[PDB]
Write an enzyme that holds these catalytic residues in place. Structure first.
Site, PDB file in Angstrom:
ATOM      1  CE1 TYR A  27      -2.956  -3.274   1.190  1.00  0.00           C
ATOM      2  CE2 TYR A  27      -4.184  -1.681  -0.072  1.00  0.00           C
ATOM      3  CZ  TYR A  27      -4.059  -2.946   0.440  1.00  0.00           C
ATOM      4  OH  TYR A  27      -5.046  -3.886   0.189  1.00  0.00           O
ATOM      5  N   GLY A  29       2.840   4.108  -1.392  1.00  0.00           N
ATOM      6  CA  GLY A  29       3.271   4.741  -2.614  1.00  0.00           C
ATOM      7  C   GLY A  29       2.403   4.388  -3.789  1.00  0.00           C
ATOM      8  N   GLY A  31      -0.429   1.466  -3.281  1.00  0.00           N
ATOM      9  CA  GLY A  31      -1.537   0.635  -2.805  1.00  0.00           C
ATOM     10  C   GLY A  31      -2.833   0.472  -3.563  1.00  0.00           C
ATOM     11  CG  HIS A  47      -1.984   8.218   4.049  1.00  0.00           C
ATOM     12  ND1 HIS A  47      -1.478   8.355   2.777  1.00  0.00           N
ATOM     13  CD2 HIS A  47      -2.040   9.459   4.567  1.00  0.00           C
ATOM     14  CE1 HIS A  47      -1.290   9.636   2.516  1.00  0.00           C
ATOM     15  NE2 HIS A  47      -1.620  10.330   3.586  1.00  0.00           N
ATOM     16  CG  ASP A  48      -3.590   3.933   0.221  1.00  0.00           C
ATOM     17  OD1 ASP A  48      -2.863   4.945   0.109  1.00  0.00           O
ATOM     18  OD2 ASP A  48      -3.147   2.819  -0.126  1.00  0.00           O
ATOM     19  CE1 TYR A  51      -4.107  12.052   1.938  1.00  0.00           C
ATOM     20  CE2 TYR A  51      -3.171  11.107  -0.066  1.00  0.00           C
ATOM     21  CZ  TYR A  51      -3.056  11.946   1.024  1.00  0.00           C
ATOM     22  OH  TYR A  51      -1.868  12.672   1.194  1.00  0.00           O
ATOM     23  CE1 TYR A  64       0.104  19.227   5.361  1.00  0.00           C
ATOM     24  CE2 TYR A  64      -1.125  18.163   3.630  1.00  0.00           C
ATOM     25  CZ  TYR A  64      -0.097  18.156   4.518  1.00  0.00           C
ATOM     26  OH  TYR A  64       0.770  17.094   4.531  1.00  0.00           O
ATOM     27  CG  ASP A  89      -0.739  14.088   4.192  1.00  0.00           C
ATOM     28  OD1 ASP A  89      -1.405  13.140   3.745  1.00  0.00           O
ATOM     29  OD2 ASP A  89      -0.374  14.973   3.384  1.00  0.00           O
TER      30      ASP A  89
END
Lengths: 121, 6
Positions: A27, A29, A31, A47-48, A51, A64, A89
């Site tokens: 996952y 970079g 995933g 994290h995926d 998002y 941000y 993040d």
């Protein structure tokens, strides 16, 4: 943005985002499928998913702002998308730091065919 | 690059 996330990762872990986290496990970079290989890979899985909770945001390019309050990451107020992207993040960078103890170089450049099956967020 | 102290 990806570049900001990258710098946050380096600040947090001392590892360069590319290549330590850009092609790690199933996952990190890139995933999509498979059982995550280890805790670090699970950081990327989550994290995926994070998002994925933001279909109408653009985390690769949207910038941000955040600050450090004695080590702590504090996301500063921007647009709704930016705020939510930052929190995703921030969580991943913390997750990577928390799992540096099991990071394994053997999972760098992990081949796609060893990543099979969908795991629901 | 992102200093504040230390």
């Amino acid at each position: 943005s990806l570049l900001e996330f990258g710098k946050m990762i380096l600040e947090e872990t001392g590892k360069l985002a590319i290549p330590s986290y850009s092609s790690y496990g199933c996952y990190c970079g890139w995933g999509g499928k498979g059982t995550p290989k280890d805790a670090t890979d699970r950081c990327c899985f989550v994290h995926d998913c994070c998002y994925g909770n933001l279909p109408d945001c653009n985390p690769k390019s949207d910038r941000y702002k955040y600050k450090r309050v004695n080590g702590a990451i504090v996301c500063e107020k921007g647009t709704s998308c930016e705020n939510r992207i930052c929190e995703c993040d921030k969580a991943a960078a913390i997750c990577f730091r928390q799992n540096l103890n099991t990071y394994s170089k053997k999972y760098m450049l992990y081949p796609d065919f060893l990543c099979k099956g969908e795991l629901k967020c | 690059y992102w200093a504040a102290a230390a």
